[model samples]
Target: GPLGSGDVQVTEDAVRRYLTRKPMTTKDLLKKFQTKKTGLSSEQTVNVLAQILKRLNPERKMINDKMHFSLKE
Candidate 1:
């Protein structure tokens, strides 16, 4: 899927894959995504991250606290 296409599933998968390697601060995650060759603008990537984390955290699939995120074990 194209970056910043607002595809929730794609965002979720990317976040899950990244977090599987290690926990990350929201700032770091945003920085990494923005630095990548993703077609998304920095704002779009930020929006994607915000939405994905917001949705997943409540479902307990992703952990969000103290500005850090990780996959829920």
Candidate 2:
């Protein structure tokens, strides 16, 4: 499979993989996916991301006024 991908369809796996790399702000996550292959409204994109985040039940942290999600132990 081709590894150099771009704007691929967002998936739960994809979301988790990102968190595994590093915690991400909801804004960063949503904005990052905005350019990806979302098939509905931009707001809807965040909706799906939110749904996935719930299922993942990620470890979250706050920085100043920012919240970042993580999948680390």
Candidate 3:
């Protein structure tokens, strides 16, 4: 089976919801994501988070402060 294919939306939605509550570093987010049933391997989860961050960054829905990320205020 394709790894992480099923988790793309789950991970993105989880991150979006989490960011709505509070800012988080990539490290923190990765840790949290790993604990959830995201169905992604560790490496795939990291890649997914990066893609999520990149997509959200340009949309201005999220701001990346060095290594931290937060919903646009």
Per-residue accuracy of model 1 over 1-73 as CA lDDT, tens digit each:
2554433333777877777777777776675674345767777878878898888772233335454566745
TM-score (all chains, Cα) for each model = 0.62, 0.75, 0.63
Over 38-66, each residue of candidate 2 has an lDDT whose tens digit, in order, gives: 55578777788889999988998776778
Show pairs that collide, candidate 3. none
Which window of ten consecutive residues has the lowest lDDT sum in model 3? 1-10
Q: Which candidate leads in TM-score? A: 2
What TM-score would candidate 1 get against the native?
Answer: 0.62
Q: Extract clashing residue pairs from model 2.
A: none
CA-lDDT, candidates in order: 0.64, 0.75, 0.65
lDDT winner between 1 and 2, please give it.
2
Error of 2 at 36 (Å): 6.0
